[PDB]
Structure formats: C-alpha cells, structure tokens
C-alpha cells in the first residue's frame, strides 16, 4: 500500500524562525533527512486525519536565504508551501511578496499559507491590520509562535484540505510536539485572535 505525502517548501527571510518551526515536530525532527547537494534538511511530518495518515515533507533551508534567492532544485515539485515572516521585523513582511513571486514562478498555482511567527513576544511591530498580502489570491494566514507551539497545526490542516479537497478533513490527534520553551499568554492570544477577525470583516 502506497502512502499519502506532499512536498512542502518552507520559505521566508532568514531569522524568521523557519527552522525553529519545522523542528517542533519530534518525529519529523528525528527522521529528517539531508540533501547535501542542495543544502536542505527534509522533515517528514505525519499528521493523523480522520481520513488517515498524511505526510508533509517539509524542506528546510541550511540558511542560504540570507545571501540571496533559492535554486529551482529547491522549489521543484513543491505541492504546497508556507511563507513565513517575523512579526517583530517589518522588513521580513515587506519581503513576503518577493518570496511569493520566486515561488509561483516555479510552482504555478499551489496552495500557500502565510505565517506570522514570534507572536509570543510582547512588543509586536506588524499588527493584524498591517497584514494584507493574503487578502489577494489563495493565501490563508495564521499568527504562529514556534516556541510555544501556538497554532502549529493550523497551516497544515488548511493545506491538507486543499490538497485532498476535503473541507471536512480533521486531525484526530495533535502530533507529538517539543515542550513550549516560552509561554503564550492567553491574553495576547485572545487580543491577537480578535484583532484578526475585526480585520477580515472590515477593509
């Protein structure tokens, strides 16, 4: 019997926390592999859906993004993607369109999720009102916090529903995750979740 797996490329400015993020998933981290001809650790992240097991094969960079754009060999056969920026860092958000372009160019029309990492930090710079890129297109957006696991599963659930074409797909159990190294205040999470809704119904 053949398995269900997708190549998921993880792009965004260096320092946004991509590596921190893919690593929250213990089994993915320990079974991850290493394409040395491309400088890339692939991380098999299995999620258990009410329909069965699904594997996102997340391609994480060995840092080459701080010094320019990535090679086609990286984007090849991508079947979905996550774009990440740092909410403490406006420039990372300003380079989001840049990544999106370099992506679409190689991956004509694949599902993409935009992610605001580091929401755990109090002094945030890129509030919900500023987040607008996803308004256009086929770009679902979630606040996330790698270090507290906050919304870790969201990006993946949303990507699974598109690649399966099942709006009613559910994860039966949350995968095994590294213990949250920082806390995610329920206040911030509540204000930030609320600041996301009171934006989608507005402009």
């Amino acid at each position: 019997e053949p398995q269900v797996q997708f190549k998921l490329v993880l792009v965004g400015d260096g320092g946004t926390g991509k590596t921190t993020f893919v690593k929250r998933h213990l089994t993915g981290e320990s079974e991850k592999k290493y394409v040395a001809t491309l400088g890339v650790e692939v991380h098999p992240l299995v999620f258990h859906t009410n329909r069965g097991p699904i594997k996102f094969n997340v391609w994480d960079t060995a840092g080459q993004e701080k010094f320019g754009g990535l090679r086609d060999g990286y984007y090849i056969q991508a079947q979905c993607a996550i774009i990440m920026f740092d909410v403490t860092s406006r420039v990372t958000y300003k380079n989001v369109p840049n990544w999106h372009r370099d992506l679409v160019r190689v991956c004509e029309n694949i599902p993409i999720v935009l992610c605001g990492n580091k929401v755990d930090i109090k002094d945030r710079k890129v509030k919900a009102k500023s987040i607008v890129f996803h308004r256009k297109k086929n770009l679902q957006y979630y606040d996330i916090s790698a270090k507290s696991n906050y919304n870790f599963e969201k990006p993946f659930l949303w990507l699974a529903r598109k690649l399966i074409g099942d709006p009613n797909l559910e994860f039966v159990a949350m995968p095994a995750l590294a213990p949250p190294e920082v806390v995610m205040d329920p206040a911030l999470a509540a204000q930030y979740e609320h600041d996301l809704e009171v934006a989608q119904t507005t402009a």
């Binding site: 797996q5 001809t37 890339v40 098999p44 391609w59 060999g73």
Partner: peptide, 26 residues
C-alpha cells in the same frame, strides 16, 4: 511512482534519478 530515499520526493518510472536534487535511483 517510486520515492527517493534522500529527500522523499515522488519521482516517475521514466525518471532514473531525482528531478529535484539529481540523486540516483537505487
């Protein structure tokens, strides 16, 4: 379709190596 045991990409039978990292099929 077989799978490359280096990067996990799903290549084709007509492919004899990997269309992503140029790695040989075993």
């Amino acid at each position: 379709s077989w799978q490359c045991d280096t990067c996990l990409l799903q290549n084709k039978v007509t492919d004899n190596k990997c269309i992503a990292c140029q790695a040989a099929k075993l």
